[PDB]
Amino acid sequence: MNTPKEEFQDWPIVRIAAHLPDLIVYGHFSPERPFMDYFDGVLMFVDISGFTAMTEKFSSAMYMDRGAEQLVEILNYHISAIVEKVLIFGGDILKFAGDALLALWRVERKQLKNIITVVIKCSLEIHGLFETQEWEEGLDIRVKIGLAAGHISMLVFGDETHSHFLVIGQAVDDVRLAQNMAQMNDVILSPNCWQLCDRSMIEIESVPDQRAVKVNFLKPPPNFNFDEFFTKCTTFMHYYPSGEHKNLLRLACTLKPDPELEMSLQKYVMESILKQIDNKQLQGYLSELRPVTIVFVNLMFEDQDKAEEIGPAIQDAYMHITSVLKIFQGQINKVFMFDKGCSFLCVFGFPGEKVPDELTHALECAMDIFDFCSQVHKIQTVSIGVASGIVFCGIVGHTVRHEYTVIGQKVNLAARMMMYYPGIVTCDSVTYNGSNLPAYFFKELPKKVMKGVADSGPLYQYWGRTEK
């Protein structure tokens, strides 16, 4: 008999799994929300610095109304190469957000030393992709990489139809602090990463007024062979594609239909993405430069390094946030947590073809969230930034590992407003002026220099309907 070969791999469950890390796809966990798990690993935070400041360039008339299409194409061309490097080096891409991605190598404590060496090699090869690269003339296509290592907690929260996850703890905070110290072309190790690494492998230098270090070179011993070393490291990589599947970037490409697994995984993915996955919407429909209102919510914690306290508090806040968003068709696009602050990137006005009073409603939703979350046990401070304008929306990353993302100066502005103006609901000039709400509903604020923002315009606190 004939033997026609090659397994069919294009099932809905496989398409859904592209939107998720192995941490979730192969997770198998409890029905309870919140769910918490604890492990050790190495984290890599890759920032494509300056990229957002080039989303605004693609709004110009020169792109002839194909700005969003050209933006997603060039971003994915470069980000796909970074993703492929991470995946071939055995990493799990956790999330894409803003200009960045975060990857994880989960391993037992005893293997952390050797895995750091793998992750440094990976980081150097990523830099290597961009060594002789630009577009017009002064294009700064270079990345900044922070690495951290140590204890990691995962939190999964949500309701009967939606799930979200976050990674938490000192290694998570450290990786963002490390990437923030990086200049273009740097690999920065967190203090704990430098403490746990194989110091015979690397030459470092001190970072002024910091315990983190910069990697100058990976200079391995005379008898060292990276390929044979990496092979030894794969013993500890549960899902590294191997044997008959050694030609694949992810084991998740091999997932077979399983309705119970698909029910769990689809909860993490927006309904408009599922519509595209199901071939009920055109594959290009979600790449757009679209006017939206960003409502960026930050929850700061009492018992701040305490994962077992923060989990219930985030779940309780989430249950309220999702009810408020439902009424006015808002969406949670991203959640992430650093420096004991859990942030929700909420968006009013993307795939859906309508919403009339987007601004008064966005402000009222922000105040509702603010009032409720302020009364949640263990939540110390709630801060909300509200900004409105044109943002890029689209699926970013590699065919095998990508996520819907929102990118733009107004997203960065709302993020910076919630950090620089803590404990209040703030809005930009577009939102203030457009709402047509009486001026006494607001307080005009002092202008702050915000790292990353070049002229915010006037900013306002949304004071609310009453003096009290």
Ligand X SMILES: Cc1[nH]ncc1-c1ccccc1Cl
Three-state secondary structure call for residue 240: coil
Q: Which residue, 100 or 325, has its beta carbon nearer to ligand X?
A: 100
Q: Sketch the per residue contact string, 209 through 238, with ligand X: x for CB under 6 A, - otherwise.
A: ------------------------------
Instruction: Tell me if 164 contacts ligand X by CB under 6 A.
Output: no
Instruction: Tell me if 145 contacts ligand X by CB under 6 A.
Output: no
Q: Which residue, 198 or 303, has its beta carbon nearer to ligand X?
A: 303
Q: Which residue, 201 or 310, has its beta carbon nearer to ligand X?
A: 310
Instruction: Tell me if 253 contacts ligand X by CB under 6 A.
Output: no
Contact segment (CB under 6 A) with ligand X among 132-140, 330-338, 370-378, 426-434 equals 330-338
Residue from the set 166, 295, 359, 395 that interacts with ligand X by CB under 6 A: 166
Token output for 416: 């910076």
Q: How far is CA 172 from the centre of its chain?
A: 12
What sign has the CA pseudo-torsion 294, 300, 304, 308? negative
Contact between residue 457 and residue 434 where contact means Cβ atoms under 8 Å apart: no
Burial class (CB in 10 A: 0-12, 13-18, 19+), 466: exposed
Shortest Cβ distance from residue 228 to ligand X (Å)?
A: 31
Shortest Cβ distance from residue 152 to ligand X (Å)?
A: 9
Number of other residues whose CB lies within 10 A of the CB of residue 119: 30
Residue from the set 267, 338, 355, 434 that interacts with ligand X by CB under 6 A: 338
Angle at 183 between CA 182 and CA 185, to 5 degrees: 100
Q: Which residue, 26 or 338, has its beta carbon nearer to ligand X?
A: 338
Token output for 186: 């740097």
Instruction: Tell me if 187 contacts ligand X by CB under 6 A.
Output: no
Closest C-alpha to 419, from 391, 452, 390, 443: 452
Radius of gyration of the chain measured on its C-alpha atoms: 22
Distance CA 454, CA 435 (A): 24
Residues annotated as binding site?
Answer: 47-52, 95, 99, 144, 167, 176, 337, 406, 412-416
Instruction: Tell me if 316 contacts ligand X by CB under 6 A.
Output: no
Contact segment (CB under 6 A) with ligand X among 99-107, 220-228, 256-264, 369-377 equals 99-107
Residues annotated as binding site for ATP?
Answer: 47-52, 99, 144, 406, 412-416
Beta-strand relationship, 379-398 and 35-47: unpaired
Residue from the set 153, 266, 412, 431 that interacts with ligand X by CB under 6 A: 412
Residue from the set 42, 143, 292, 337 that interacts with ligand X by CB under 6 A: 337
Q: Which residue, 98 or 351, has its beta carbon nearer to ligand X?
A: 98
Instruction: Tell me if 102 contacts ligand X by CB under 6 A.
Output: yes
Number of other residues whose CB lies within 10 A of the CB of residue 247: 7
Shortest Cβ distance from residue 259 to ligand X (Å)?
A: 27
Closest C-alpha to 150, from 44, 40, 45, 37: 40
Distance CA 272, CA 370 (A): 28
Distance CA 67, CA 50 (A): 17
Distance CA 197, CA 168 (A): 21
Instruction: Tell me if 34 contacts ligand X by CB under 6 A.
Output: no
Q: Which residue, 255 or 387, has its beta carbon nearer to ligand X?
A: 387
Residue from the set 148, 407, 418, 424 that interacts with ligand X by CB under 6 A: 407
Shortest Cβ distance from residue 420 to ligand X (Å)?
A: 12
What is the tally of helices (H) and strands (E) in the chain? 14, 16
Whether the bond between 34 and the residue before it is cis, its omega within 30 degrees of 0, is: yes
Q: Count interface residues toward ligand X (CB under 6 A).
A: 24
Shortest Cβ distance from residue 2 to ligand X (Å)?
A: 46
Shortest Cβ distance from residue 34 to ligand X (Å)?
A: 14
By CB under 6 A, what part of segment 345-374 binds ligand X? 345
Residue 445 per-residue DSSP state: P
Residue 414 per-residue DSSP state: H
Binding residues for ligand X, rule: CB under 6 A, are: 47, 52, 94-95, 97-100, 102, 166-167, 172, 176, 179, 334, 336-338, 345, 407-408, 411-412, 415
